[PDB]
């Protein structure tokens, strides 16, 4: 059985970045080179591996993380980066081993008048740990006075919608992102090039 990859890349609904979706890829024929020439990708960059030299490797598990961000935030889905997405939404480790794949989805994810379904976290008391997920909706206390569950002075709703529109500039258009992390554990390898 070939690795269910079209299920991730061709999923109808994609997660909001703050609530990024994980799919675990199990024991299957991992064919990596065909993927790299499966569609026109605006981003295909790998970290400690090649698109062709992966077809001679074995791993315990592959994790496929998927979400939507705007074009000018794709740069943030890389080791060592900063910004709202890397700090408070989706963090890659320093020693990351995987690929980051992205494509423009303005044909799909943009609605006229705005698609307000996609959220990102604007405020957090501290940066996320690598592969951390925060789905909390606590009002963000920037002040000394407590927020009683209601936004106000010094009390900020922590999430914001992108509001993707078709006429938006390239940097502001929605981009679908798939992140493939490659794992090794003290257990038999399951996914192989």
């Amino acid at each position: 059985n070939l690795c269910p990859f079209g299920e991730v890349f061709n999923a109808t609904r994609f997660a909001s970045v703050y609530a990024w979706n994980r799919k675990r890829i199990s024991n299957c024929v991992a064919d990596y080179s065909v993927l790299y020439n499966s569609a026109s990708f605006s981003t295909f960059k790998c970290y400690g591996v090649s698109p062709t030299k992966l077809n001679d490797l074995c791993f315990t598990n592959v994790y496929a993380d998927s979400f939507v961000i705007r074009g000018d935030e794709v740069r943030q889905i890389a080791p060592g980066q900063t910004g709202k997405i890397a700090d408070y939404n989706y963090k890659l480790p320093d020693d990351f081993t995987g690929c980051v794949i992205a494509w423009n989805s303005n044909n799909l994810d943009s609605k006229v008048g705005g698609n307000y379904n996609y959220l990102y976290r604007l405020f957090r008391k501290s940066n996320l740990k690598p592969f951390e997920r925060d789905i909390s909706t606590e009002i963000y206390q920037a002040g000394s006075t407590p927020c009683n569950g209601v936004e106000g002075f010094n009390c900020y709703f922590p999430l914001q919608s992108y509001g993707f529109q078709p006429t938006n500039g390239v940097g502001y258009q929605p981009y679908r992102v798939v992140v493939l992390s490659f794992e090794l554990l003290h257990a038999p390898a399951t996914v192989c090039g």
Partner: antibody
Amino acid sequence: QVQLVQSGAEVKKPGSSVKVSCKASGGTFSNYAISWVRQAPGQGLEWMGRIIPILGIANYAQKFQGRVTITADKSTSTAYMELSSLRSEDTAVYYCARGYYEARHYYYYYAMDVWGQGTAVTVSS
Amino acid sequence: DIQMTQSPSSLSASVGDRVTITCRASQSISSYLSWYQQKPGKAPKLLIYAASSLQSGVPSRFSGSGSGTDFTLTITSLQPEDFATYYCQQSYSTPRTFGQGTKVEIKR
């Protein structure tokens, strides 16, 4: 030209509950908070609470906590205010109003820009 | 809870007048201050937000100012359509309390 259309007038006995609807029309508002404000006859305005429809997050003034529930159906773009253990003092016109909550629209400071037409609720035996 | 006290409770004015309504907060509220108009049997309508910003489509005879606790709504060249009740509302913190209102009546 987004309007907010509320359900009709209601008469209710003491101790019962009322549920009032608020429907977005000429739009499907998803960027906005929905507040509920009430006005007793001859009296001022009183903020009851708000819902953030997108995530179904609702919070209420201390005064109404325990008795009030605000919900939103995302598909219909309908918000609901249910008030329970009704008392004659709950006789009022109830307003829904659309306002802001997001940092992008900070410069409104949560002002309520579009109001429903109101719902007269009469509580009496 | 922040208390909002409006004054005067009501005032009488003639078409053409310049009218001032004040709202005092129990503490400093920055610009978390809005002004609303209400006519008998009708929903309130937003005039001013952020203390000073004129709401889109509202006549420019309405304006707001204020600093700290003290806020004012001014109607410069009062027209018949402007006789109404006016409410301030703070949105600084829960609950988002309103002033008790100011009725602008016709002088005779």
